[PDB]
Amino acid sequence: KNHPMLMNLLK
Amino acid sequence: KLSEEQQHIIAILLDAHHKTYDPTYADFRDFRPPVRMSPLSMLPHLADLVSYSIQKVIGFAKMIPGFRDLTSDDQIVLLKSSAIEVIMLRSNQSFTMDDMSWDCGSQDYKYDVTDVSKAGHTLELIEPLIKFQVGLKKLNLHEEEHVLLMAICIVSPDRPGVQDAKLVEAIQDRLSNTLQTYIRCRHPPPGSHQLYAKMIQKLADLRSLNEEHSKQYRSLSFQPENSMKLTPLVLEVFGN
Ligand SMILES: CCC(O)(CC)CS[C@@H](C)C1=CC[C@H]2/C(=C/C=C3C[C@@H](O)C(=CCO)[C@H](O)C3)CCC[C@]12C
């Protein structure tokens, strides 16, 4: 939640 | 005693590590230049180091057998809480006891106590962090045990906010058993003595270090002037 970049790096 | 699956898990984690840790430290030239004179003069440089390091830990985490089977939300929680711990662990590879500093290729990229001080941290963290590095180094882990410890650290069921802790616990256990069995077969005595128990204890030290780091991070991140010097990723993962 609220984690755009960490979500993107996890593919 | 090492099954085929466990020899596979170790092959995966070794490769995953080698693809996410460059021992030539070539990328360090991309980070903001380190300043040694000057309050928080090392903050911009080490902030970038950590931000870079968070990316690499994520790359390693994705390749941990079973990690993918988890929900994205549990993936997020595990990384967000383990990130600083895994960076402290993986940093042991550049840490030399010859002078108690992280030696990353050159003098400019060699970091010691005073450098961390000029990053905004007190001795209340720095001393036990070095103590940790020294105690971990003296274990002389096989690189196989090194990568297993980081994976086991990342997949901890007890992290606050985890949902399917059962699945997380089943991923970690399969990793624990792989480590325990590896120590028996591949790590000869006496260096294998209590080796697993001592490694798990390091996960305990990391919990304490994490707890202390967060405390000091919030104090530093409280002043927007310091928060500016960080990166968007570091802010997203370490909290806003
Ligand atoms: C700047 C403030 C902040 O709290 C948060 C952004 C970090 S300071 C302190 C807590 C800390 C932890 C890891 C330590 C260190 C890590 C060293 C690494 C070098 C290398 O081994 C490495 C990767 C090679 O690419 C690791 O990922 C990180 C040594 C210096 C000090 C470092 C950064």
Q: Which value, to the nearest 10 degrees, does the dihedral of the CA atoms of residues B8, B9, B10, B15 take?
A: 90
Cβ-Cβ contacts under 8 Å, B79 against chain A: 6, 10
Minimum distance, in Å, between the CA of residue A8 and any CA atom of chain B: 10
Query: Ligand 1: does its nearest atom lie under 6 Å from the Cβ of B89?
Result: no
Instruction: Supply the range of the domain harboring residue B64.
Output: 1-240
* Chain A residue set in contact with B, beta carbons under 8 Å: 1-7, 9-11
Contact B106, B196 (CB under 8 A): no
Give B62's contacts in chain A (Cβ within 8 Å): 10-11
CB contact under 8 A, A10 and B79: yes
Q: What is the 3-state secondary structure (H, E, C) of chain B?
A: CCCHHHHHHHHHHHHHHHHHCCCCCHHHHHCCCCCCCCCCCCHHHHHHHHHHHHHHHHHHHCCCCCHHHCCHHHHHHHHHHHHHHHHHHHHHHCEECCCCEEECCCCCCEECHHHHHCCCCCHHHHHHHHHHHHHHHCCCCCHHHHHHHHHHHHCCCCCCCCCCHHHHHHHHHHHHHHHHHHHHHHCCCCCCCCHHHHHHHHHHHHHHHHHHHHHHHHHHHHCHHHHCCCCHHHHHHHCC
Q: How many domains does chain B have?
A: 1
B43 ligand 1 Cβ < 6 A? yes
Q: What resolution (Å)?
A: 2.3
> How far apart are the CA of B54 and the centre of ligand 1, in A?
10
- For residue B96, report the phi and psi dihedrals to the nearest 5 degrees: -115, 135
User: Does the beta carbon of B160 lie under 8 angstroms from any beta carbon of chain A?
Assistant: no
CATH code where residue B75 lies: 1.10.565.10
Residue of the CA atom closest to atom 18 of ligand 1: B91
Q: How was this structure determined?
A: X-ray
Q: Tell whether residue B214 is among the known ligand binding residues.
A: no
Q: How far is the CA of B49 from the centre of ligand 1 (A)?
A: 6
Question: Which residue lies with its CA nearest to atom 27 of ligand 1?
Answer: B53
